[PDB]
Structure 1
Amino acid sequence: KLLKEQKYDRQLRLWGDHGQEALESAHVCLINATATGTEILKNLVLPGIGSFTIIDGNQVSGEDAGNNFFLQRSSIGKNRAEAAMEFLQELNSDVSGSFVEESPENLLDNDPSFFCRFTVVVATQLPESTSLRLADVLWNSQIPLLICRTYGLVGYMRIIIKEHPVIESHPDNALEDLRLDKPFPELREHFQSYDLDHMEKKDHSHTPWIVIIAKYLAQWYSETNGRIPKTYKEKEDFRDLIRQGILKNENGAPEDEENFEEAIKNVNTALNTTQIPSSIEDIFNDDRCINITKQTPSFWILARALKEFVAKEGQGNLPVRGTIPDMIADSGKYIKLQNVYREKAKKDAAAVGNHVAKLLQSIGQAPESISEKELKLLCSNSAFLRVVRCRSLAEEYGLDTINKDEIISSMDNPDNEIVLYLMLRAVDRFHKQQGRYPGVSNYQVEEDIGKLKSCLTGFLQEYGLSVMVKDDYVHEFCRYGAAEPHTIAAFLGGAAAQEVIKIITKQFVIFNNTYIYSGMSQTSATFQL
Structure 2
Amino acid sequence: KLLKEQKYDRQLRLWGDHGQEALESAHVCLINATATGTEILKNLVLPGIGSFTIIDGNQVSGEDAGNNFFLQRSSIGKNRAEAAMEFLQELNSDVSGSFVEESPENLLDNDPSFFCRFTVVVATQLPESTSLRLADVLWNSQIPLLICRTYGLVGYMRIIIKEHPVIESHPDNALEDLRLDKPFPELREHFQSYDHSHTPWIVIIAKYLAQWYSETNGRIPKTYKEKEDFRDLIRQGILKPEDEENFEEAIKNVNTALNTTQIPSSIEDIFNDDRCINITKQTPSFWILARALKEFVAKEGQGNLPVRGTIPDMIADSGKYIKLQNVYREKAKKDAAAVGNHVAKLLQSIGQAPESISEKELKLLCSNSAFLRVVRCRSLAEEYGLDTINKDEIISSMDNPDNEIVLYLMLRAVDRFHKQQGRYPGVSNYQVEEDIGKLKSCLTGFLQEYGLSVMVKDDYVHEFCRYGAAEPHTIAAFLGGAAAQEVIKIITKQFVIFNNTYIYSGMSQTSATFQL
Asked if TM exceeds 0.5, the reply is: yes
Q: Deviations over 1:406-461 (max 9, x none)?
A: 00101111111111101010011111111111122222222221111110011001
Moved more, 209-218 or 183-192: 209-218
CA distance in 2, matches of 1:528, 1:286: 21
CA–CA separation in structure 2 for the residues paired with 1:258 and 1:90: 56
Distance 1:231 1:150 in 2: 51
Task: Give CA-to-partner distance per residue, 1:372-421, whole Å, 9 cap, x none.
Answer: 11110011001011111100000000000000010010111111111110
Could you say what secondary structure the match of 1:53 adopts?
Answer: strand
Alignment of 1:358-397 (within 5 A): 358-397=345-384
Query: Whole-Å Cα distance in 1 between the matches of residues 81 and 235 of structure 2?
Result: 68
What is the TM-score normalised by the length of structure 1? Answer: 0.96
Alpha-carbon separation, structure 1, partners of 2:449 and 2:47: 44
Greater shift after overlay, 229-238 or 489-498? 229-238
Determine if contact 2:436/2:462 at 8 Å carries over to the other structure: yes
Equivalent residue, structure 2, for 1:350: 337
Q: Distance in 2 between matches of 1:8 and 1:180?
A: 41
**Partner SS for 1:98:** strand
Q: Give the Cα–Cα distance (whole angstroms) in 2 for the partners of residues 79 and 237 of structure 1.
A: 74
Shift of 1:258: 1.4
Paired residues of 2:345 and 2:354 also in contact (CA < 8 A): no
- Supply the distance in 2 between the matched residues of 1:70 and 1:242 (Cα, whole angstroms): 65
Aligned-partner SS, 1:419: helix
Distance 1:260 1:9 in 2: 39
Shift of the alpha carbon at 1:145?
A: 0.4
CA shift for structure 1 position 487: 0.8
8 Å Cα contact 1:177/1:320 also seen in 2:
yes
Unaligned residue ranges in structure 1 (runs of 5+) = 195-202, 249-253
Cα distance, 1:243 vs structure 2: 2.5
Q: Does 1:240 align with 2:232?
A: yes
Question: Does the CA contact (< 8 Å) of 2:271 and 2:294 recur in 1?
Answer: yes
User: Partners of 1:77 and 1:478 in 2: how far apart?
Assistant: 28
- Among residues 211, 220, 224, which one is paired with 2:203 in the alignment? 211
Q: Is the CA contact 1:32–1:125 (under 8 Å) kept in the aligned structure 2?
A: yes
The CA deviation at 1:225 is 3.1
Moved more, 358-367 or 372-381: 358-367
Cα contact 1:231–1:268 (8 A) shared by 2? no
Other structure's SS at 2:148 match = strand
User: Is the deviation greater in 80-89 or in 473-482?
Assistant: 473-482
Give the 4+ runs in structure 1 shifted more than 3 A: 229-232
Query: Hey, what's the Cα distance between the residues in 2 that align with 1:36 and 1:231?
Result: 52
User: Measured at CA, do residues 450 and 213 of structure 1 come closer, stay the same or move farther in structure 2, by a change above 3 Å?
Assistant: same
1:78-112 residue CA offsets vs partner (Å, 9 max, x unmatched)? 11001100100000010000101111000111011
Superposition pairs of residues 283-322 of structure 1, within 5 angstroms = 283-322=270-309
1:233 is displaced (CA, Å) by: 2.7
* Seq. identity, %: 100
CA distance in 2, matches of 1:92, 1:174: 37
**Do 2:29 and 2:52's aligned partners in 1 also have CA atoms closer than 8 Å?**
yes
Deviations, residues 127-150 of structure 1 (Å, cap 9, x unaligned): 011000001100000011000000
Q: Count residues in correspondence.
A: 516
**CA distance, structure 1, for counterparts of residue 256 and residue 412 of structure 2:** 46
Q: What secondary structure, in the 3-state scheme, does the structure 2 residue paired with 1:458 have?
A: helix
Give the match's secondary structure for 1:517: strand
Which residue number in structure 1 is paired with residue 429 of structure 2? 442
CA contact (8 A) 1:318 1:382 kept: yes
* Deviation at residue 230 of structure 1 after TM alignment: 4.3
CA distance in 1, matches of 2:445, 2:228: 60
Aligned-pair CA distance for 1:318 = 0.5
Residues 16-48 of structure 1: CA deviation (Å, up to 9, x unaligned): 111111111111100011000010000110011
Aligned residue for 2:369, secondary structure, equals coil
User: After alignment, is 53-62 or 237-246 more displaced?
Assistant: 237-246
Partner of 2:30: 30
Q: Deviations over 1:180-199 (max 9, x none)?
A: 100000111111111xxxxx
SS of the residue corresponding to residue 310 of structure 1 reads helix
Contact 1:32-1:56 within 8 A present in 2 as well: yes
Q: State the Cα distance separating 1:222 from its structure 2 match.
A: 2.2
* Residue-by-residue CA offset, 1:307-332 (whole Å, 9 max, x unaligned): 11001110001000011011110111
Contact 2:343/2:354, CA 8 A, preserved across alignment: no
The SS at the match of 1:405 is helix
Between 467-476 and 82-91, the greater mean CA deviation after superposition: 467-476
Contact 1:319 1:349 survives alignment (8 Å): yes
Q: Quote the Cα distance in structure 1 between the aligned partners of 2:216 and 2:470.
A: 69
Moved more, 13-22 or 222-231: 222-231
Contact 1:124 1:148 in 2 (8 A): yes
Distance 1:33 1:247, change over 3 A: same
* Aligned-pair CA distance for 1:6: 1.0
Q: Say yes or no: does 1:42 pair with 2:42.
A: yes
Distance 1:479 1:230, change over 3 A: farther
Q: CA deviation at 1:342?
A: 0.4
Q: How big is the shift at 1:124?
A: 0.2
Instruction: Render the CA deviation track for 1:204-247: whole Å, top value 9, x for unaligned.
Output: 11111111111122222322333223443322222222223222
Are the aligned partners of 2:297 and 2:304 in contact in 1 as well (CA < 8 Å)? yes
Residues 28 and 118, structure 2, Cα contact 8 Å, conserved in 1? yes
- Offset at residue 270 of structure 1 (A): 1.5
Cα distance in 1 for partners of 2:243, 2:436 equals 71
The structural deviation recorded for 1:67 is 0.7
Deviations 1:238-294 (A, max 9, x none): 22222232224xxxxx43321012111211121111100111101111111111111
- Which deviates more, 136-145 or 359-368? 359-368
Tell me how far apart the structure 2 counterparts of residues 87 and 5 of structure 1 sit (CA, whole Å). Answer: 24
On the 8 A contact 1:89/1:95 being kept in 2, the answer is yes
CA offsets, 1:147-190, max 9 Å, x none? Answer: 00000111011000111111111111011100110000011111
Q: Distance in 2 between matches of 1:134 and 1:482?
A: 22
- Counterpart CA distance in 2 for 1:367 and 1:315 is 24
**Mean Cα displacement is larger for which, 215-224 or 108-117?**
215-224
Query: Structure 1: how far apart are the matches of 2:27 and 2:165?
Result: 20
Q: CA deviation at 1:14?
A: 1.2
Higher alpha-carbon deviation: 64-73 or 225-234:
225-234
Q: Could you tell me how far apart the structure 2 residues matched to 1:221 and 1:446 are? A: 78
Q: In structure 2, what is the Cα distance between the partners aligned to 1:498 and 1:229?
A: 42
CA distance in 2, matches of 1:267, 1:318: 23
- Aligned partner of 1:176 in structure 2 is 176
- Partner residue in 2 for 1:55: 55
Instruction: Please give the per-residue CA displacement for 1:344-372, whole angstroms capped at 9, x wherever unaligned.
Output: 00110011111111111111111301111
Distance 2:507 2:248 in 1: 47
Q: Is the 8 A contact 2:125 2:149 kept in 1?
A: yes
Aligned-partner Cα distance in 2 for 1:242–1:464: 63
- Contact kept? 1:293, 1:363, Cα under 8 Å: yes
Q: Contact 1:15/1:507 (CA < 8 Å) preserved in 2?
A: yes
Aligned-partner SS, 2:446: helix
Deviation at 1:496, TM superposition (A): 0.4
Distance 1:184 1:489 in 2: 53
